[PDB]
């Protein structure tokens, strides 16, 4: 299989922004490329087919260009309808394959999480099983480290993470790590922290109840 | 343009046929494609079928999972995925190609194929309660735990419509075990939080389970 | 039966472009959109080469880097065509050019073949061939014709209007620096039959309709 | 690039004996991407055998194809009349695609010596203004020879040109011409025009030659 791989892997811009997204195929592919959008949710749309040619329908801000390995997108002034994930996805030799995506993000100015703990509900812990959940609230950049710490013992292998799509008026995020642990084994215990590293933060901020 | 059958939850070792409506262009002038798209693996290209003469392509990878067929009066295309397992989760595509030219530009809304071991479940909704303080001044944060569901979707709402502001309701994640949980969250002033009535107006489809729950302070250790 | 069907031969200035065809004909040819369409040629000397080919499906070209731009290939779908042309030519794309196929949309092996196209380049012009004697010295015997400065090829020659076959030998041609052929006609024969025997050798050259005989015949001496 | 070099440039053997034909591919390749191929004169290429072992449909069974990683094998169990031809392997793994240079498989016979003889230019050509003078080498086995062209014991070097015919349907003989062109000014300012042939059927150098003037 030809390898195709997109650089680079995530984004930031802002409206009017020339924006470039490129692809390098592991071997000459002779323009037999396509770019694709997809946003959430979504169906693909193809962009630009065979390197340099333009869908029907595709706004003309939209172009493709390249030889042999290397193929780049080009976004002249970036659209809000423009925010979404791009794809290459190659049709010289069998099979076609896909670029694993450049998503293409809002950029604002940074923002901080404010964090949020809470301890299981009452009624969970007469089953077997207590989950406790970590909040982090509106924040910007997407990266973002939650370490619980149990009796300030770092632990591994039985959180979940879970990241909202970027909000449609802060452009932040939101972030819900839940811990989940036997009632047995929840009973150490009660110092539960859930500690946040983040780049809007001085230092670790720290929830425990 | 392109439109597929519904979406499927479906059982280990079954089968599914799923299809694909061209209209508004020469159904015969185009090849008709199979994507699917997966967290795992991305996007990969399972085969491809001409509708003139009912001519295949297939991926090595998906070689005998999938076979593609085609009716030509109907101007729809099928596929066919057999001896099913849970990694076959996915969404997956129908798109086009024409010998001309281009392209993959069309592309049908997508199917989702879900296979799990796992039987029909309702939610189990958990108050994920206000703690006592602070934070930073305002504001303070709540929410509700919808916990093991199967399978997705379940629609949280708060206080139904009077509350589309400030609420994340995230999305859900596949427990081990096979289960979904989610978890919904609002933030509202740190002042009333004793002034105003929240309940989660979770209900969840797939079994006809519509759950209210309120959150409040809870006052012990 | 895949039967190819390739234009007929051609002869071009360098600097100009050859535009060869490939005609798929065939009861068992099928879907001609469905295979992939291989270009390659074999110049005298050398290995055969890789040009690059039209996938099926899609219809799109591979091309060897070599030739990337030089050459162009495309298919017509509706006359199951497929096309090679090669531009600026030069003496050094004098080749046999071929079109094949095989079994996949893709190019693999190559299954089937069209019969070949031969393409000479040369700044020639067509010139029918002077002949001269190749006299048998005196001193078996040998003797021939000189068949000189033609083109293009072929001329063929025979003896005593096809009477004399056994012990002849006609060459292949040779190209000189003079961009134009050279060739010879040997027959051996008894000595004692260098008076008696009459030998005439019967150059002929379509290409100019130029048909010349010599007589061949000891010299004094 | 995958390189494919193929071994040897010409197999010399008779009918009904095996032919063993090599090709060396420049790096691993999965034998899933390897061919082998038939060119009869005159004739299209055959495909024999794809995927390195698998024969063609339609093809005798006295060929197979082995091998794996780098070198592949191209057999011929017996060789009937018709197998007297170029071989070349290709492989389609990568880009370009490629082939080898082809190996020639020929029919062995006893050696035999050439008939030489040596043709000087006619006075008809002379006229104008180019002299060939031709070396005949006629009927021989095996097709190395070598023929050199002295003017007045001057060995000559890039004035002339040589021309092999087909290996012969009935005696599986070469013949070979080689002529030298000068022109009539440089013909006409020597004497002694020799023509001699080394050639393993020769216990000793054949020379033939003439002397501008016998008119």
């Known amino acids: 299989?030809?390898?195709?791989?997109?650089?680079?892997?995530?984004?930031?811009?802002?409206?009017?922004?020339?924006?470039?997204?490129?692809?390098?195929?592991?071997?000459?592919?002779?323009?037999?490329?396509?770019?694709?959008?997809?946003?959430?949710?979504?169906?693909?749309?193809?962009?630009?087919?065979?390197?340099?040619?333009?869908?029907?329908?595709?706004?003309?801000?939209?172009?493709?260009?390249?030889?042999?390995?290397?193929?780049?997108?080009?976004?002249?002034?970036?659209?809000?309808?423009?925010?979404?994930?791009?794809?290459?996805?190659?049709?010289?030799?069998?099979?076609?394959?896909?670029?694993?995506?450049?998503?293409?993000?809002?950029?604002?100015?940074?923002?901080?999480?404010?964090?949020?703990?809470?301890?299981?509900?009452?009624?969970?812990?007469?089953?077997?099983?207590?989950?406790?959940?970590?909040?982090?609230?509106?924040?910007?950049?997407?990266?973002?480290?939650?370490?619980?710490?149990?009796?300030?013992?770092?632990?591994?292998?039985?959180?979940?993470?879970?990241?909202?799509?970027?909000?449609?008026?802060?452009?932040?995020?939101?972030?819900?790590?839940?811990?989940?642990?036997?009632?047995?084994?929840?009973?150490?215990?009660?110092?539960?922290?859930?500690?946040?590293?983040?780049?809007?933060?001085?230092?670790?901020?720290?929830?425990?109840? | 343009?392109?439109?597929?059958?519904?979406?499927?939850?479906?059982?280990?070792?079954?089968?599914?046929?799923?299809?694909?409506?061209?209209?508004?262009?020469?159904?015969?002038?185009?090849?008709?494609?199979?994507?699917?798209?997966?967290?795992?693996?991305?996007?990969?290209?399972?085969?491809?079928?001409?509708?003139?003469?009912?001519?295949?392509?297939?991926?090595?990878?998906?070689?005998?999972?999938?076979?593609?067929?085609?009716?030509?009066?109907?101007?729809?295309?099928?596929?066919?995925?057999?001896?099913?397992?849970?990694?076959?989760?996915?969404?997956?595509?129908?798109?086009?190609?024409?010998?001309?030219?281009?392209?993959?530009?069309?592309?049908?809304?997508?199917?989702?194929?879900?296979?799990?071991?796992?039987?029909?479940?309702?939610?189990?909704?958990?108050?994920?309660?206000?703690?006592?303080?602070?934070?930073?001044?305002?504001?303070?944060?709540?929410?509700?735990?919808?916990?093991?569901?199967?399978?997705?979707?379940?629609?949280?709402?708060?206080?139904?419509?009077?509350?589309?502001?400030?609420?994340?309701?995230?999305?859900?994640?596949?427990?081990?075990?096979?289960?979904?949980?989610?978890?919904?969250?609002?933030?509202?002033?740190?002042?009333?939080?004793?002034?105003?009535?929240?309940?989660?107006?979770?209900?969840?489809?797939?079994?006809?389970?519509?759950?209210?729950?309120?959150?409040?302070?809870?006052?012990?250790? | 039966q895949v039967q190819l069907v390739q234009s007929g031969a051609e002869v071009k200035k360098p600097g100009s472009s050859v535009k060869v065809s490939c005609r798929a004909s065939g009861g068992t040819g099928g879907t001609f959109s469905a295979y992939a369409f291989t270009w390659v040629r074999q110049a005298p000397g050398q290995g055969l080469e890789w040009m690059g080919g039209?996938?099926?499906?899609?219809?799109?070209?591979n091309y060897a880097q070599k030739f990337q731009g030089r050459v162009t290939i495309t298919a017509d779908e509706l006359t199951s065509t497929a096309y090679m042309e090669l531009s600026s030519l030069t003496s050094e794309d004098t080749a046999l050019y071929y079109c094949?196929?095989?079994?996949?949309?893709?190019?693999?092996?190559?299954?089937?073949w069209g019969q070949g196209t031969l393409v000479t380049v040369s700044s020639a012009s067509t010139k029918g061939p002077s002949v001269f004697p190749l006299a048998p010295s005196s001193k078996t015997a040998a003797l021939g014709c000189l068949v000189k400065d033609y083109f293009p090829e072929p001329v063929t020659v025979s003896w005593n209007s096809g009477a004399l076959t056994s012990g002849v030998h006609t060459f292949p041609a040779v190209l000189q620096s003079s961009g134009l052929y050279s060739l010879s006609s040997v027959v051996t024969v008894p000595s004692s039959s260098l008076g008696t025997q009459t030998y005439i050798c019967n150059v002929n050259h379509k290409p100019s309709n130029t048909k010349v005989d010599k007589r061949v015949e000891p010299k004094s001496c | 690039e995958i390189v494919l070099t193929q071994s040897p440039g010409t197999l010399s053997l008779s009918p009904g004996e095996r032919a063993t034909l090599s090709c060396r591919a420049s790096?691993?390749?999965?034998?899933?991407?390897l061919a082998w191929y038939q060119q009869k004169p005159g004739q299209a290429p055959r495909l024999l055998i794809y995927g390195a072992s698998s024969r063609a449909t339609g093809i005798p069974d006295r060929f197979s194809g082995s091998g794996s990683g780098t070198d592949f094998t191209l057999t011929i169990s017996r060789l009937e009349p018709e197998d007297f031809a170029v071989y070349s392997c290709?492989?389609?793994?990568?880009?370009?695609?490629?082939f080898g240079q082809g190996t020639t498989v020929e029919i062995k016979r006893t050696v035999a010596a050439p008939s030489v003889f040596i043709f000087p230019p006619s006075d008809e050509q002379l006229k104008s203004g180019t002299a060939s003078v031709v070396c005949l080498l006629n009927n021989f086995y095996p097709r190395e020879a070598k023929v050199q062209w002295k003017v007045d014991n001057a060995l000559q070097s890039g004035n002339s040109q040589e021309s092999v015919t087909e290996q012969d349907s009935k005696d599986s003989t070469y013949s070979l011409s080689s002529t030298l062109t000068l022109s009539k000014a440089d013909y006409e300012k020597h004497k002694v025009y020799a023509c001699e042939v080394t050639h393993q059927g020769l216990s000793s150098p054949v020379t033939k030659s003439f002397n501008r003037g016998e008119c």
């Open positions: 094949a196929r095989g079994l996949y949309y893709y190019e693999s092996s190559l299954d089937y």
């Open positions: 039209i996938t099926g499906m899609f219809g799109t070209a």
């Open positions: 790096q691993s390749l999965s034998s899933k991407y």
């Open positions: 290709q492989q389609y793994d990568g880009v370009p695609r490629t």
